[PDB]
Amino acid sequence: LPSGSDPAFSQPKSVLDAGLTCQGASPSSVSKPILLVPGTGTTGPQSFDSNWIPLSTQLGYTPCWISPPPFMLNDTQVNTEYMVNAITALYAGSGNNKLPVLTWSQGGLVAQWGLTFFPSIRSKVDRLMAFAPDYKGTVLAGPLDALAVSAPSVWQQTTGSALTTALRNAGGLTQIVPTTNLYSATDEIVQPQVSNSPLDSSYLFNGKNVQAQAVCGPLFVIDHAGSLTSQFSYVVGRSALRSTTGQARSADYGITDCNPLPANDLTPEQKVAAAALLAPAAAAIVAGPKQNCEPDLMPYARPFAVGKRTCSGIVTP
Numbered sequence: 529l530p531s532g533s534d535p536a537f538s539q540p541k542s543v544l545d546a547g548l549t550c551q552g553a554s555p556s557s558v559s560k561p562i563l564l565v566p567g568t569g570t571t572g573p574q575s576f577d578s579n580w581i582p583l584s585t586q587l588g589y590t591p592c593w594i595s596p597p598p599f600m601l602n603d604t605q606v607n608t609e610y611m612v613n614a615i616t617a618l619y620a621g622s623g624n625n626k627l628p629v630l631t632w633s634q635g636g637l638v639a640q641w642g643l644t645f646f647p648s649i650r651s652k653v654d655r656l657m658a659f660a661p662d663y664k665g666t667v668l669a670g671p672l673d674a675l676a677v678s679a680p681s682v683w684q685q686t687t688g689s690a691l692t693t694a695l696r697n698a699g700g701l702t703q704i705v706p707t708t709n710l711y712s713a714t715d716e717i718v719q720p721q722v723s724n725s726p727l728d729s730s731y732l733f734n735g736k737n738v739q740a741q742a743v744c745g746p747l748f749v750i751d752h753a754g755s756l757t758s759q760f761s762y763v764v765g766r767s768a769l770r771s772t773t774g775q776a777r778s779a780d781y782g783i784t785d786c787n788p789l790p791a792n793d794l795t796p797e798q799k800v801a802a803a804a805l806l807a808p809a810a811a812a813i814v815a816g817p818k819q820n821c822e823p824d825l826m827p828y829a830r831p832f833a834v835g836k837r838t839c840s841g842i843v844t845p
């Protein structure tokens with residue numbers, strides 16, 4: 529695992545601060561905060577206001593979130609800057625107290641990239657609850673890369689990319705802080721997720737890796753969005769955030785919790801919204817930026833991906 533000082537921010541602090549927002553609070557005077565990191569093609573509110581913003585409020589947290597522009601479609605290394613800055617702020621603002629991080633899809637990759645390359649936040653992050661994280665990218669993005677219709681983060685979230693290679697070689701496929709990874713074998717966006725083994729994109733060594741079908745059986749189907757919004761997902765998330773081990777406890781969930789529909793504590797209005805979670809995301813992707821190469825790795829990550837090819841050529845130290 530990398531050590532030493534944190535790499536410098538490529539973006540101005542003022543820009544990173546504008547991306548951070550808390551519900552009913554300022555990061556400089558927030559109480560019991562929880563940082564939420566959105567998925568690709570969405571903003572914090574787009575990913576969570578129909579699910580984890582109201583759910584985490586009910587658990588006694590002040591939900592905060594980052595909205596890296598544009599809709600998490602730009603360089604993942606930059607999106608990570610919004611998070612690193614957010615954690616530094618919230619930690620100090622809550623009176624120097626560790627806080628939990630809750631992510632969805634790419635947000636999980638962003639969280640792990642930050643923990644791996646920015647040492648200073650490892651002691652500030654209490655635990656990590658990731659839903660459908662793609663630490664190893666996805667094979668499904670492959671075709672889009674070929675047709676040159678992929679946004680910067682889509683290339684990076686491609687299996688075998690320079691980014692996911694750098695994460696692996698840096699030691700990021702093993703938890704850094706207590707981590708729970710809830711995911712589904714029936715994920716239409718992120719694959720492979722079928723083996724319920726280290727072969728899965730969402731698997732982290734030493735982590736509490738929870739594949740939905742391992743607990744609920746093969747006929748339990750929850751897609752990329754259901755992994756975040758479902759009643760079962762809620763029961764595992766609540767377990768993870770309350771747990772004294774920092775990870776969800778098997779004793780806290782089971783077969784009786786195998787409900788694929790949006791969490792019960794959501795209003796009828798929120799459930800409908802949670803059900804159409806993918807619509808805005810797909811729209812943003814379809815209309816967003818496109819390129820025929822993967823964005824270059826920043827200096828700090830280059831030694832870990834020697835030989836891979838990015839927009840400027842073959843990576844070298």
Ligand SMILES: CCCCCCCCCCCCCCCCCC(=O)OCCOCCOCCOCCOCCOC
Binds near residue numbers: 669677752806814
């Ligand atoms: C309704 C789309 C279902 C299509 C199933 C085939 C898979 C193709 C989509 C792979 C895109 C890879 C995105 C990066 C992986 C991580 C995504 C993430 O962080 O979570 C966010 C949710 O992502 C929503 C993606 O769904 C939209 C994909 O559909 C866009 C297809 O349009 C292609 C047109 O060219 C832009």
Ligand SMILES: *[C@@H]1O[C@H](CO)[C@@H](O[C@@H]2O[C@H](CO)[C@@H](O)[C@H](O)[C@H]2NC(C)=O)[C@H](O)[C@H]1NC(C)=O
Binds near residue numbers: 538539597598602603
């Ligand atoms: C999107 O990501 C790109 C790639 O990292 C960012 O571009 C860099 O931005 C810094 C600060 O302006 C410059 O010093 C670098 O020269 C840029 N590099 C490249 C390759 O463009 C960009 O700032 C991010 N975009 C948004 C909208 O946040």
